[PDB]
Ligand binder design. Structure first.
Ligand SMILES: COc1cc2nccc(Oc3ccc4c(C(=O)NC5CC5)cccc4c3)c2cc1OC
Length: 289
């Protein structure tokens, strides 16, 4: 809230928005002239319900200022404008990501997956591959490195909070706002949220990605015994689409001591190298077959 609000730069006229169908509250809409292109654009709008508690108002208002303060980054949902002046409801507008959350998307591609491609490639039009999985991981790491470098803590980093746009570009959203499955031990037992606890979560996210949309800790009940084992040191087993290195990155993220966990910067470099390693390998697979 301390943060300022430049209406000149962000305010957008309400009658320039055509509110469409709901998505989640979040609504799909068309905005005319929302950006320089002065064209029509599909956008996602988060708005307050009729007569919302003045608490929900500043809540959504701070959501808008967080976005304005954080700034722009390709891997973080982009703020396009807002309706804050009197005359209608408060609305925060962001770019639209047509494919939705990464989790649901990955689940829908389980029958359309191959670790890598070889000619004839049309046998794999729009197929998910290891490069895709590692690439999504890389992008989210960069987004997190971006948020972290700004003292911003996600608090709920999971696949459902990752959105997918055109050309396999993923974006982080709903930051700084059961979920026990993504919470680090210290967050559960001490209620402590740090950048390092977001790393633990990144670990669960990795698992989601390499399980192609699976729910973490399958078959396990989330009770006292579950939390205890998390403390004892017990960890999920490798997911079905993981590579050896990736599962170790998960384990690293799930280190008991927060300080011993990798930083998002380290993770960006690591996943970056994995991505290249995979590409080289793929070039060979592709060249000899
Ligand atoms: C096709 O399905 C969807 C596509 C979507 N594409 C883009 C954005 C969507 O919802 C969102 C997600 C996060 C925010 C935040 C925000 O992240 N605020 C925190 C930054 C403080 C602030 C303001 C509006 C938002 C709209 C979408 C929702 C969908 O359905 C659920």
């Amino acid at each position: 809230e301390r943060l300022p609000y430049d209406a000149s730069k962000w305010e957008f006229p309400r009658d320039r928005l055509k509110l469409g169908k709901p998505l989640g509250q979040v609504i799909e809409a068309d905005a005319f002239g929302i950006d320089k292109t002065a064209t029509c654009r599909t956008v996602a709008v988060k708005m307050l319900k009729e007569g919302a508690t003045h608490s929900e108002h500043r809540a959504l208002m701070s959501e808008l200022k967080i976005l304005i303060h954080i700034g722009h980054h390709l891997n973080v949902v982009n703020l396009l404008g807002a309706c804050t002046k009197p005359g209608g409801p408060l609305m925060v507008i962001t770019e639209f990501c047509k494919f939705g959350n990464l989790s649901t998307y990955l689940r829908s591609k389980r029958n359309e997956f191959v670790p890598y491609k070889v000619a004839p490639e049309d046998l794999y039009k729009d197929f998910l591959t290891l490069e895709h999985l590692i690439c999504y991981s890389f992008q989210v790491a960069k987004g997190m490195e971006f948020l972290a470098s700004r003292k911003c803590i996600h608090r709920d980093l999971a696949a459902r909070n990752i959105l997918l746009s055109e050309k396999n570009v993923v974006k982080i959203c709903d930051f700084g706002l059961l979920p026990l499955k993504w919470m680090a031990p210290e967050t559960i037992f001490d209620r402590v949220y740090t950048i390092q606890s977001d790393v633990w979560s990144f670990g669960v996210l990795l698992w989601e990605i390499f399980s192609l949309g699976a729910s973490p800790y399958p078959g396990v009940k989330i009770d006292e015994e579950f939390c205890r084992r998390l403390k004892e040191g017990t960890r999920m087993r490798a997911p079905d689409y993981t590579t050896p290195e990736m599962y170790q990155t998960m384990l690293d993220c799930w280190h008991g001591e927060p300080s011993q966990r990798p930083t998002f910067s380290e993770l960006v470099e690591h996943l970056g190298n994995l991505l290249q390693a995979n590409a080289q390998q793929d070039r060979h697979h592709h060249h000899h077959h």
